[PDB]
Design a protein around this ligand. Structure first.
Ligand code: NA
Length: 185
């Protein structure tokens, strides 16, 4: 298991592998990743992206951002108290380590800097918005509270259950998302 991806070609491959699992595509396996439904389930999307990296022999970090968050899909807005995505480390063309967020719910075309990512979580086309804090964690953290408490989903039982519950959903409705209380760990 490697924390640093060896090159940009591999980072791009991994991005494509993640995008290929998006709900709405012919290419995805069960459960598809519900990037088109940004209302909720970010934690599950992130952990499923991490599973794809691990399938490939890589791990990553999570970045959690907290605040009065607002994001747009291009036709509707969602409001969040937190968001999470995977923060991938890789070696650039001269062997120096760089990091990028992968989050196709906000950036469908490729990896982006964490500063661009956090700014998309405070999108003022959806009204007032601000970041109160952000934190990086090991990838294995499923959720991090603003008080630095961790929860885990090591066998992806919660992840897969939530993704399945949200499988048919798209856009910014329904909001709140349907109940996922019955999904275990
Ligand atoms: Na979420």
């Amino acid at each position: 298991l490697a924390s640093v991806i060896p090159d940009v070609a591999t980072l791009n491959s991994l991005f494509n592998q993640i995008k290929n699992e998006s709900c709405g595509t012919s290419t995805a396996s069960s459960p598809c990743i519900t990037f088109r439904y940004p209302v909720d389930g970010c934690y599950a999307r992130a952990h499923k992206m991490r599973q794809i990296l691990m399938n490939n022999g890589y791990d990553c970090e999570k970045q959690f951002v907290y605040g009065n968050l607002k994001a747009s899909t291009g036709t509707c807005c969602v409001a969040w108290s937190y968001h999470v995505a995977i923060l991938v480390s890789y070696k650039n063309a001269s062997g120096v380590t760089e990091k990028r967020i992968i989050d196709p719910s906000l950036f469908s075309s490729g990896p982006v800097t964490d500063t661009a990512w956090r700014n998309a979580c405070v999108n003022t086309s959806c009204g007032s918005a601000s970041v109160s804090s952000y934190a990086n964690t090991a990838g294995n953290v499923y959720y991090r509270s603003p008080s630095n408490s961790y929860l885990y989903d090591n066998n992806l039982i919660n992840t897969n259950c939530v993704l399945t519950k949200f499988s048919l959903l798209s856009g910014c409705s329904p909001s709140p998302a349907p109940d996922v209380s019955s999904c275990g760990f």
